[PDB]
Curated annotation (Swiss-Prot), chain B:
Entry protein name: Ryanodine receptor 1
Full-sequence range covered: 728 to 1647 of 5035
Organism this protein belongs to: Sus scrofa
Domain observations: The calcium release channel activity resides in the C-terminal region while the remaining part of the protein constitutes the 'foot' structure spanning the junctional gap between the sarcoplasmic reticulum (SR) and the T-tubule. Pore opening is mediated via the cytoplasmic calcium-binding domains that mediate a small rotation of the channel-forming transmembrane regions that then leads to channel opening.
Gene: RYR1
Subunit structure: Homotetramer. Can also form heterotetramers with RYR2. Identified in a complex composed of RYR1, PDE4D, PKA, FKBP1A and protein phosphatase 1 (PP1). Repeated very high-level exercise decreases interaction with PDE4D and protein phosphatase 1 (PP1). Interacts with CALM; CALM with bound calcium inhibits the RYR1 channel activity. Interacts with S100A1. Interacts with FKBP1A; this stabilizes the closed conformation of the channel. Interacts with CACNA1S; interaction with CACNA1S is important for activation of the RYR1 channel. Interacts with CACNB1.
Role, per record: Cytosolic calcium-activated calcium channel that mediates the release of Ca(2+) from the sarcoplasmic reticulum into the cytosol and thereby plays a key role in triggering muscle contraction following depolarization of T-tubules. Repeated very high-level exercise increases the open probability of the channel and leads to Ca(2+) leaking into the cytoplasm. Can also mediate the release of Ca(2+) from intracellular stores in neurons, and may thereby promote prolonged Ca(2+) signaling in the brain. Required for normal embryonic development of muscle fibers and skeletal muscle.
Residue span, B30.2/SPRY domain: 287-469, 563-713
Subcellular location: Sarcoplasmic reticulum membrane
Family per similarity comment: Belongs to the ryanodine receptor (TC 1.A.3.1) family. RYR1 subfamily.
Sequence repeat locations: 115-228, 229-329
Modification after translation: Channel activity is modulated by phosphorylation.
Swiss-Prot record, chain D:
InterPro entries the record matches: FKBP-type_PPIase, PPIase_dom_sf, PPIase_FKBP_dom
Gene, per the UniProt record: FKBP1B
Regulation affecting activity: Inhibited by both FK506 and rapamycin.
PANTHER family for this protein: PEPTIDYL-PROLYL CIS-TRANS ISOMERASE, PEPTIDYL-PROLYL CIS-TRANS ISOMERASE FKBP1B
GO MF assignments: calcium channel inhibitor activity; calcium channel regulator activity; FK506 binding; peptidyl-prolyl cis-trans isomerase activity; signaling receptor binding; transmembrane transporter binding
This protein's name: Peptidyl-prolyl cis-trans isomerase FKBP1B
Any one of the GO BP annotations: regulation of cardiac muscle contraction by regulation of the release of sequestered calcium ion
Keywords recorded for this protein, A-Z: Cytoplasm, Isomerase, Rotamase, Sarcoplasmic reticulum
One Pfam family cited in the UniProt record for this chain: FKBP_C
Species annotation: Homo sapiens (Human)
Disulfide bond residue pairs: none
């Protein structure tokens, strides 16, 4: 519906966690519960210049 | 060419060079240290404008001296020559600039520059409407009188406001004027002049196409006059009383007529003054008859234009008071990335900044883009235009909104979804349908490259993102979506190519839409031939325009000048060539001859008077001339010289054959037509290269044929082009010999570094200064047969 | 026959913004004059 | 013989004498305008002794008439330089040579 705020959420996570984001995206592909997934466990230069839950959103929007 | 001077040497420090130009009888002369040089240029073309120029390489320092307060001359100019500083236009200021640049240095980086508008020598001749025969209609005679009366009242009021008072003899110090009287009390000749001027305002309105006619018959008796206080009264009892026109409002069409009326008056005045021998000059000289305002109205200063417009506007309000009603080819430049940088996958982003608002275009292009087609007019590019929000790919569509100075456009391409997106100042541009993407469903093909196009007088800046911190709106839109700068992780700046508008000769493509070239073998009675034909002469989409064709290989003259029987033909050194024009093609539209390696004129109105030519004359100290040489780059003859007298057009269906003969040992070139001699001949210097060439304008299905034949005791052309065939009298056409045609534009590579040149005003006495210090070098590849680098 | 190679220098040109021409009925004068002074020059900064 | 034209004037008093050594910078091209040699490319001045048949005739005759610091141009006819045999792979037979010579130092 209204996903103009997705970049704001994406800005919260550092690029290093990118490899995590896809991995959990597979767990929601198996219809796993949120609690289990929580239990189941130059870009940097620009990120450092400034003073999980997202993967569910991308997985849901992938449909 | 060498010249004689007292104490000859190459230019050295403390030398002074003086240049003199005489437009009358084209003449250019030089003096060094006050001693004249014994050589002159003359008899050159006169179209266009002339300017001084100095050319140099690294490691020089010079100063320009132009006279006046821009550098004092070290020697007295010849008696009739004027200083250059007098030639500055009223709207401009003196400065130093380069010639036809396409790049500039800026604060945040280099700027790209489009073509520059320039004046022409026909912009200095005034052309009035010439409405002499025009005669004011009878129904406008009353208003002519009333108009003159009010113009007088207004004039008198202005004088009186500025302290003028009546006296019988004009005195400009005491501000006494005899015309400060009632209109009816002026001397008859002055009244008549005023009536003539009023009538010519009316006649000029009519010549400009105005409809002038009575509309409100009540308006006149409702007019009132301005009532001035007694302090505006002259000693003779006269007090001006101009009409109160405060209620009158010019319509837009009437304002435009005021504006148009003025220019015509200034132009006719300027033409009248020029007819008596006056001229323009930045400084006034009454005895020399030079005035600082003798230019056409377009080039005048704003203050003078407004001052001239004021009186005409006043007259227009007065007239409306009485109830009357009155009712490619260097036009664009294209820059693009190099072919090696084409991308076939990923998501990419770059930025473009518009320094000026105008006709500019930006987007993505295919590697095989053409230089002579407008950007986006075909299927090879996807482009956004900001002057008027539009998107271009195989057509024009409305899109986005217009930009302003300093705006930044971000271009993004996605090759996973095959989409193209444009953003303006971080805001995504969308069409009327509300779609976010500008283009979709794009086939990858070979890849895409950044491309931009600039019109006349425009300036722009391009950023491919070598430094991420330099981008301004990348983080706002594009960073989180997964887009990357185009030039990231690159050690050196990206190489750029641009469109160069210099005509060059190129081979005819094997699949050209309109033209076809055929090779014909030699029979028992015919020589080998190269024939040209038109493919679509009669169709609706036919293309008809001038054609400049030449052969591929040249002939060269020697270093020194000093039924066939073999004894004559083995040492003849004379060569022959032929051209056949078929019946149906008008012989009045064909020029035949030779060209030099440096012909670059793509002219659509070609004529034998357009050929560049010059004469260099050498003389002695006592005034005796030693030699005079003529230089040109085209030696041709016109077909119309060989048409039959009184011929009724192309009614006669007969072919025409023109032959050319050259002597490589004496430098003499001659022509024959239908076996008859011609009076034209040419003489050239040793060590010269020549190419056979034909200029044509098609008028029939079959146009022309090159014939490599042979005459008695004269060798064919093949014996002059190829070394192994130097003694073979049998004509032949090897595969290396082919026909070429002239092309207007091409591609060129931009250098990586440029010379640094500094200019400044050295001083009021010293003049202007130019200086260059840092050397630069390049590696050049040379093609010998075309004499090119 | 074979393509040639060499090393060459860059050159450039400089002009003022004064323009002069001739035509029928033109408003411009016909004769002009100007001067140039040389202060410094290095005969061989490079091999050329 | 050889023709000499002055490009830049020199001392005008000192001339090469017998037994001395001349140090020069030169550039040689064919009559057609094609360069074939240059000592400035190698960045080392050329040094030769006059009268010991070390170089071709025309170069020596041209250098004999130049003063110290002068810069001039020389022209050599085929019968003076390499004749009708030429220089195999460099100079074609029967070629006229043009040189641009600057005289730097003597002995």
């Amino acid at each position: 519906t209204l996903k103009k705020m997705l970049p704001i959420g994406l800005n919260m996570c550092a690029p290093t966690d990118q490899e995590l984001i896809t991995l959990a995206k597979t767990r929601y592909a198996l219809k796993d519960t949120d609690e289990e997934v929580r239990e189941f466990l130059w870009q940097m230069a620009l990120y450092r210049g400034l003073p999980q839950e997202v993967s569910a959103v991308l997985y849901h929007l992938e449909q | 060419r060498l010249v004689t001077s007292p104490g000859q040497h190459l230019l050295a420090p403390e030398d002074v060079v003086s240049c003199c130009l005489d437009l009358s009888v084209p003449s250019i002369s030089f003096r060094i240290n006050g001693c004249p040089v014994q050589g002159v240029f003359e008899a050159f073309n006169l179209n266009g404008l002339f300017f001084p120029v100095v050319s140099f390489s690294a490691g020089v320092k010079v100063r320009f001296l132009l006279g006046g307060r821009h550098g004092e001359f070290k020697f007295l100019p010849p008696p009739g020559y004027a200083p250059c500083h007098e030639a500055v236009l009223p709207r401009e200021r003196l400065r130093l600039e380069p010639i036809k640049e396409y790049r500039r240095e800026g604060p945040r980086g280099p700027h790209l520059v489009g073509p520059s508008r320039c004046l022409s020598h026909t912009d200095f001749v005034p052309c009035p409407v010439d409405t002499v025969q025009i005669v004011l209609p009878p129904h406008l005679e009353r208003i002519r009188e009333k108009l003159a009366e009010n113009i007088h009242e207004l004039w008198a009021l202005t004088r009186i406001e500025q302290g003028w008072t009546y006296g019988p003899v004009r005195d400009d110090n005491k501000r006494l004027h005899p015309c400060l009287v009632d209109f009816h009390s002026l001397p008859e000749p002055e009244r008549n002049y005023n009536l003539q001027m009023s009538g010519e305002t009316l006649k000029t309105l009519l010549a400009l196409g105005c409809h002038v006619g009575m509309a409100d018959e009540k308006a006149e008796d409702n007019l009132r006059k301005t009532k001035l206080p007694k302090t505006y009264m002259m000693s003779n009892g006269y007090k001006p009383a101009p009409l109160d026109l405060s209620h009158v409002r010019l319509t837009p069409a009437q304002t435009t007529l005021v504006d148009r009326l003025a220019e015509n008056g200034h132009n006719v005045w300027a033409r009248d003054r020029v007819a008596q021998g006056w001229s323009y000059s930045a400084v006034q000289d009454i005895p020399a008859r030079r005035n600082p305002r003798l230019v056409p109205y377009r080039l005048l200063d704003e203050a003078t234009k407004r001052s001239n417009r004021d009186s005409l506007c006043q007259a227009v309000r007065t007239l409306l008071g009485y109830g009357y009603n009155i009712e490619r080819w260097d036009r664009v430049r294209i820059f693009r990335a190099e072919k090696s940088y084409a991308v076939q996958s990923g998501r990419w982003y770059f930025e473009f900044e518009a320094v000026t608002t105008g006709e500019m275009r930006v987007g993505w292009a295919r590697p095989e883009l053409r230089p002579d087609v407008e950007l986006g007019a075909d299927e090879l590019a996807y482009v956004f235009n900001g002057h008027r929000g539009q998107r271009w790919h195989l057509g024009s569509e409305l899109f986005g909104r217009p930009w302003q100075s300093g705006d930044v456009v971000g271009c993004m391409i996605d090759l996973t979804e095959n989409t193209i997106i444009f953003t303006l100042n971080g805001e995504v541009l969308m069409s009327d349908s509300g779609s976010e993407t500008a283009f979709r469903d794009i086939e990858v093909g070979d890849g895409f490259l950044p491309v931009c196009s600039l019109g006349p007088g425009q300036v722009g800046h391009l950023n491919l993102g070598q430094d991420v911190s330099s981008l301004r709106f990348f983080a706002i839109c594009g960073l989180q979506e997964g887009f990357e700068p185009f030039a990231i992780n690159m050690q050196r700046p990206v190489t750029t190519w641009f469109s160069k508008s210099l005509p060059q000769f190129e081979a005819v493509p094997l699949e050209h839409p309109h033209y076809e070239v055929s090779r014909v073998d030699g029979t028992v009675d015919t020589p080998p031939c190269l024939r040209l034909t038109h493919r679509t002469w009669g169709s609706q989409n036919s293309l008809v325009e001038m054609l400049f064709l030449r052969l591929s290989l040249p002939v060269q003259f020697h270093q020194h000048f000093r039924r066939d029987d073999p004894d004559i033909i083995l040492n003849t050194t004379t060569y022959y060539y032929s051209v056949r024009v078929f019946a149906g093609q008008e012989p009045s539209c064909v020029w035949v001859g030779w060209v030099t390696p440096d012909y670059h004129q793509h002219d659509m109105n070609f004529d034998l008077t357009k050929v560049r030519a010059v004469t260099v004359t050498m003389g002695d100290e006592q005034g005796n001339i030693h030699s005079s040489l003529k230089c040109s780059n085209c030696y041709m003859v016109w077909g119309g010289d060989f048409v039959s007298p009184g011929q009724q057009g192309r009614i006669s269906h007969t072919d025409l054959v023109i032959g050319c003969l050259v002597d490589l040992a004496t430098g003499l070139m001659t022509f024959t037509a239908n076996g008859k001699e011609s009076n034209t001949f040419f003489q050239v210097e040793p060590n010269t290269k020549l190419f056979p060439a034909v200029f044509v304008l098609p008028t029939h299905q079959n146009v022309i044929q090159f014939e490599l034949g042979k005459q008695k005791n004269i060798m064919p052309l093949s014996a002059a082009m190829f070394l192994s065939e130097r003694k073979n009298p049998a004509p032949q056409c090897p595969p290396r010999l082919e026909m070429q045609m002239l092309m207007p534009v091409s591609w060129s590579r931009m250098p990586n570094h440029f010379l640094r040149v500094e200019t400044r005003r050295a001083g009021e006495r010293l003049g202007w200064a130019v200086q260059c210090q840092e050397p630069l070098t390049m590696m050049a590849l040379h093609i010998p047969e075309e004499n090119r680098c | 026959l074979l393509l040639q190679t060499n090393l060459i220098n860059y050159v450039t040109s400089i002009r003022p913004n004064i323009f002069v021409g001739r035509a029928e009925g033109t408003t411009q004068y016909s004769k002009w004059y100007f001067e140039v002074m040389v202060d410094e020059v290095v005969p061989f900064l490079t091999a050329q | 013989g050889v023709e000499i034209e002055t490009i830049s004037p020199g001392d005008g008093r000192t001339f090469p004498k017998k037994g001395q050594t001349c140090v020069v910078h030169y550039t040689g091209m064919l009559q057609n305008g094609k360069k074939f040699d240059s000592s400035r490319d190698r960045n080392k001045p050329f040094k030769f002794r006059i009268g010991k048949q070390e170089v071709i005739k025309g170069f020596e005759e041209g250098a004999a008439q130049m003063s110290l610091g002068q810069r001039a141009k020389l022209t050599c006819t085929p019968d003076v330089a390499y004749g009708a045999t030429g220089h195999p792979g460099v100079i074609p037979p029967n070629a006229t040579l043009i040189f641009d010579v600057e005289l730097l130092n003597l002995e």
